[PDB]
Amino acid sequence: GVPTYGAIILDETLENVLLVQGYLAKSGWGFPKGKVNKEEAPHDCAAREVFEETGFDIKDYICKDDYIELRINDQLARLYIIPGIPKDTKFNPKTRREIRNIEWFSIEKLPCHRNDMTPKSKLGLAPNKFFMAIPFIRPLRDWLSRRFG
């Protein structure tokens, strides 16, 4: 798959993260991110996708070594960590045929896994609107503990 880049934006307290809600297949909440263009650098792709989805320019805040990267089904997603963005920032997508809403979420309240259906003796996982964010939540909490404590 084509690599994706974007950002985990935190507020000044480090207890809230900025998620975006798409439509259709991307109907749930997830971090702002998207697919790299041919010949586009990782930092430039992250900033472009975040600016398209939130209207906030991370370019001057990106740190090269500060990111979480996961390989999911043989597609690589790298989110640059961007702390200290004030919660009263005005976020507006460029692309409202693509983004329904933009909200801050408490990191401690977000799930880091889906719930099974063991009460129903059925296999699989129950739907969760944070599906696209979930894989990054534990690595993020671990990264924030290492970096700040």
Ligand X SMILES: CC(=O)Nc1cccc(NC(N)=O)c1
For binding to ligand X (CB under 6 A), which residues are involved?
Answer: 4, 33, 72, 75, 77, 132, 135
Minimum separation from the CB atom of position 65 to ligand X (A): 20
Shortest separation between residue 111's beta carbon and ligand X, angstroms:
13
Q: Is 49 labelled a binding residue?
A: yes
**Residue number, 75 or 92, with CB nearest to ligand X:** 75
Nearest distance, CB of residue 90 and ligand X, angstroms: 26
Give the residue at shortest CB distance from ligand X. Answer: 77
Judged by beta carbon, residue 2 or residue 63, the one nearer ligand X is 2
- Rg, Å, the chain Cα set: 15
69 annotated as a binding-site residue: no
User: Which residues define the annotated binding site?
Assistant: 49, 53
As annotated, the binding site for Mn(2+) includes 49, 53
